[PDB]
From a paper:
Mvp1 is a poorly characterized yeast SNX–BAR protein that shares conservation with the mammalian SNX–BAR SNX8. Mvp1 was initially identified as a genetic interaction partner for the fungal dynamin superfamily protein Vps112 and is required for retrograde trafficking from the endosome. Mvp1 is therefore involved in membrane remodeling and cargo sorting at the endosome.
We determined the structure of the Mvp1 tetramer using single-particle cryo-EM. The local resolution of the final map varied from ~4.2 Å (within the cores of the BAR domain dimers) to ~7.2 Å (the tips of the BAR domains). The tetramer consists of a tight embrace of the two SNX–BAR dimers, with the two concave faces of the BAR homodimers facing each other, slightly rotated with respect to one another, around a central axis through the middle of the BAR dimer, such that the distal tips of the homodimers pack adjacent to one another. This packing serves to occlude and sequester the positively charged, concave, lipid-binding surface of each BAR dimer. First, residues from the C-terminal end of helix α1 and the loop downstream of helix α5 in the PX domain (part of the Yoke in the SNX9 SNX–BAR structure) contact the distal end of BAR helix α2 from the trans Mvp1 dimer. Second, the C-termini and N-termini of BAR helices α2 and α3 interact around the twofold long axis of the tetramer. Third, there are close contacts between the top of the PX PPII loop and helix α1 from a BAR domain in the trans BAR dimer. Together, these regions generate a tetramerization interface of 1278 Å2 at each end of the tetramer, forming a combined interface area of 2556 Å2. The structure of the tetramer suggests that the concave BAR lipid-binding surface is sequestered and the PX lipid-binding pocket is inaccessible.
Numbering used by the authors:
A (entry chain C), B (entry chain D), C (entry chain B), D (entry chain A): 129 to 501
The structure:
Amino acid sequence: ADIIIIEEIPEREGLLFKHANYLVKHLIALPSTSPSEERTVVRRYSDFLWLREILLKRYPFRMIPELPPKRIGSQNADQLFLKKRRIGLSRFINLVMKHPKLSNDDLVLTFLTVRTDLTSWRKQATYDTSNEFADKKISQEFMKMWKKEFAEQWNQAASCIDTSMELWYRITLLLERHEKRIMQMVHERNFFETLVDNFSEVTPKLYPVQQNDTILDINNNLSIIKKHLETTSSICKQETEEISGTLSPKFKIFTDILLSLRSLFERYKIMAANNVVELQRHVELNKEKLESMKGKPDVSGAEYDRIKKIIQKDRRSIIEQSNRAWLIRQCILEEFTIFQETQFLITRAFQDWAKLNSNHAGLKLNEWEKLVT
Amino acid sequence: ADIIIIEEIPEREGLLFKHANYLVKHLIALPSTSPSEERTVVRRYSDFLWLREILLKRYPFRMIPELPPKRIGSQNADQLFLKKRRIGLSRFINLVMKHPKLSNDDLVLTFLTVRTDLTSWRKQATYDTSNEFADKKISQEFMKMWKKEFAEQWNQAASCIDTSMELWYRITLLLERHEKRIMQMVHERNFFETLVDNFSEVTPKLYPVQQNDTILDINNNLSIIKKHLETTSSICKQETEEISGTLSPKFKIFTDILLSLRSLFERYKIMAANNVVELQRHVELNKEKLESMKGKPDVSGAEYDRIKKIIQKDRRSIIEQSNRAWLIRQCILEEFTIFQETQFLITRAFQDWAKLNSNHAGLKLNEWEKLVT
Amino acid sequence: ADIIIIEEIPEREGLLFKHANYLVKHLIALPSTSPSEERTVVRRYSDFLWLREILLKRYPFRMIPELPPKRIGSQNADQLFLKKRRIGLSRFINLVMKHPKLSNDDLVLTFLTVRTDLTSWRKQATYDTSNEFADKKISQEFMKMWKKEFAEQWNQAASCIDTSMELWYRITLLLERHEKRIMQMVHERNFFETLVDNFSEVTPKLYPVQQNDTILDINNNLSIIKKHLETTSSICKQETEEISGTLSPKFKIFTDILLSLRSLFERYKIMAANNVVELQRHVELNKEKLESMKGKPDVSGAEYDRIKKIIQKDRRSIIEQSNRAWLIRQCILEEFTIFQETQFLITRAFQDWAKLNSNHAGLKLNEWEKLVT
Amino acid sequence: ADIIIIEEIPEREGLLFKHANYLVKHLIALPSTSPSEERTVVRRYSDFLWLREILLKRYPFRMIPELPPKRIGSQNADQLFLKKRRIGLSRFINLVMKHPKLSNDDLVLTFLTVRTDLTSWRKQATYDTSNEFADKKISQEFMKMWKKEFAEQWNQAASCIDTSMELWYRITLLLERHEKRIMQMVHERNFFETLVDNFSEVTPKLYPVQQNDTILDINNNLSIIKKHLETTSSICKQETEEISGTLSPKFKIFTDILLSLRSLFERYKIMAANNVVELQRHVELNKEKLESMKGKPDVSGAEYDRIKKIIQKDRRSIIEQSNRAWLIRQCILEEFTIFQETQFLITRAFQDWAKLNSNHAGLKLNEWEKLVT
């Protein structure tokens, strides 16, 4: 559902700043709600915050996109830190969409197909039906690879992701810098046009006309050149806006899925820390229960009942933690899936990069050789 | 005589700074001294100062190139303000050479063909033989155009030259700026290569290999891209050094002949100010001598002899100033000649500009399309 | 235990980069290990990583300082991104120390008092004794304020902390910028000294001495001024290094405790999400068990035993989750404590700021008025 | 006659640019025209160009101020390159005024006391009465010092002036840079005020009020600090505008008299080049006339009359050139006078510099120590 979020509209512009109302333009192919012709919904940045928090509460250990930068920032006045917000926002929701469990979620579509305001929804909020997977499900192969190799597998990814996140950030930064470079270049290029026009006009005043005529030939060649520079600068700017504005998402989506897996491994490490403590209790109880086999020799109902309660609560504990451990690792793999899709995504990124650079260079070469005449 | 001045050598480098000894490499076609195979002479920046001052003293109202910036500047320590000095110096002397009267001058060739030091020359300095043209020469048409149109003609050039000097300076400045731009670009391009190499290396650590192999395909594509960027940056730098270093003189020579005509019109205005005062005396004496025709009625030998001395000295004065006025205007025209050569020089400048930009763009397009594969 | 970590030493410097060995200089007042005279221990950045991870595993919902930026960064070659690492590292450990539970922890002191390498420690790692607080402890007032006002209380802090984190970051950024400003200023100030010396030396060459002597008075006044500028620039640089280098931590510590509470509320929200799901199960089971009171009318041992297992496991569940909920909120308050210490810390920050600015301005005023003479 | 030229007015502002009409505000103490109460005259930049050219034509080898930068520049659109023009213009005319011969000139006062337009003046232009000093005047000591020491004296100044011109230019540049520095500083200072206000407002939201009250004390201290920064930034800006705007001329006047003596030595070298050629003819005729003393032995009226004409015209030539040589050197000295006034001018410059820096530092110290409370 490649949906677009453009024409963000707060209450009308002034000194102040308000939290814009974003038109969620449901360009729809997913049949959760049957694919509409189009059905816009007005929703806010606060609405998308509610959205993400609810996603986080319902679906743990699943891919989750970033947020747009904060609205309670120091000074978020001008339109830049709102345009970035809308482009990011589009990327964020649409990323939610390509992801499987979210595209199938109930919460998302209700967030999509709704015409009233947030409060009426709050009446039927009722996310109590939408919470943690407490159900035991039988893995076909209860031992596929979840610790034989996958443990070290994503243990290595845990660090490689921060490394590669810095890397890819620097890379798309470099592309943005190339773009601002070329925009400065077209600036001074039009300045150059101004100069060559003034120079054409001050060639006769400096080079006699009524005596020599070739000057007219040459300061008409310079008119050829001012027109060349006009066209060259225009197509520079065209490359800037079209090419780079539509190239940047092709890069940024990788960054966002990367830091989404960052968030994921953070949540995972700090919650599977519970299984860490539980395995430490595993060894602790192994030890205390092997020392327990003194036969319980003294006739003591107190010791009997106390350590019976101990072992029984610990037994239901170990079974529930094993249930939870497998139920976690499975979702880890479910996320590894679309991460291996991001794999091919980097391919798409670099190939589009080279292609559009080639288009730009081709037009520029054609312009140059055209000028040489 | 396209002579080159490279390998400027002061006493050896240290904290201090000395006035380098410039190897004047007489790549010679002018037969003043018969065209040598090559004959280097060691000469200093001070030597070229002596040169220019002597030229100025001997030949007034003739094209004269600039000097290199000052050696008694505030801080002229590092090699930049000496390399600019040597390139400028080459331009300055070689410009002296293409100019007719200088190429025919005696002073210049002696400055060229000499093997001793400056002092022995100072012994035979003897520039008393080389001074102002005091001789009357008969203009064929004593009225060609020297005031009917040429007066206003170069009166207009007097201002157009400062205008066009600023213009052309800005233009060649813009080219230098384009060059420094592209050098910064190749800087960050090699940084980009570093990044993509690190990214290739952290793709497997983040994208499983023993499971998925396509990652090897893609991070070998990125090796293709790092090699592309290596070649692209190398040829960027090649364009920088070769193209722009050998393009800049093609521009700067126009600037130097322009400010040479600037110097010329300065000297001319401030010395023909003498003819200005002389024409004011012309009208003053016209008036006083028409009032003089009272017949000199009183019998007075004092008044007779005094106003006779007046009229006779004023008569030799008016004839000598007319001699000088025509003898000046003629040299004005002699300079207008090579200025009308600079006319075609701007043509050469812009055409070479476009051509070498086209070469660069062509190589870059070939690199891009080669990469797309 | 205001301990210092200076003279970070990797294997010797070269092209490469290694993970320095940090001398933990136990300037000790805490008697966990009795206050030593001093006892340095060599430990690495990797060692401090092991440290922090272990802290995180053992003590949840407690103040925890940041890490230094990553060692697997893109290009961390030069010494800047290692000096920042050592200053940060000192701040990080020493912050661990002022915090109560950490200062009392067993893990930390062993990390401190140890002379062998990390591996021998790994033999006696034995952090199984050091894990999650599973014990029930009786809050004196089991209802102090943990939801009547404290819920909204830190709910508001949840957002105010990101706001104030941006703010305080900008503020200490501004101070660093002021410092770099003044360093650039002392740069051009010494350039100014160079200029005025050259100007003194070229005053006589331009202002006749053998005629006029007052020039000696004035170019000795300028010697007074060059000496003034020498002293002024020196004390500028002194203010830079001393004042700002020792002022910056006074600011940064607030930023680090702020983002420590950031990390805390992150962990807390995403783990108390478990209590969120548990309270949703609370309402769900309230509902299903009120619907359950059909008397269990049909004679069915299956339904009887199944819903008996349901209610019993849910009952032990609700008691364990209430135990955990209170056991969490208590640690929340324990952290609120030192946060209310950071309160006065901002006071210390601003007062030291103003004071050292005043010292600098005072010295500068004294220098100026001293110069006026 | 410290006259001021403010409220430059072209035809009203638009896209275009016109040559403003400058109100010459005759704050008059010189009685050439008796000191008026005040008498404004409207005059243009073109009018001042006519002025300077006329001065140059009438008075050679006398101090002459610069022009304002060119009006036919490439792009002189915005008001900066007109405000600099008006400040420069004021400096230029007022410098003309402090100079003796100009203050006594007839041309200047007519340029001052005039109410019609430039054309009516052009009717009575009549500068034929105002031209070169052709009169012989008897130097009391015909040998004061004009070559015994003054020759080398200003020969040395010829180069020292370009050196010191670069120096003093760099110096006043450095002051302008200090000013722009402090303006950027007050910019970020007011940004800092914005930050500390937002920080005060987000201290309670982050630091509990209903529990802890000291936060009110501290975020009222920060109100003290925001007011401090308000006042500090305001007085920073006051120092900027008042101090530096009124300090800069105190520096620039030295630069302008310096490059005025630059122009002077240029004119002098290139016109006394005539006396150079005349002294070369002096030695040439000494030689040819000593060789002439063959007695004129052959009976030849042709040779007799020809070399008699030679010697007689050369004799009147040598007497007229000696007249001119002394008449030049005298004006050289007349200019050396006010140059030795510029001597004390540099004193005034540096002393005012130090004083106003001291005022600024004093106010800033008072503000700081006031804040410490």
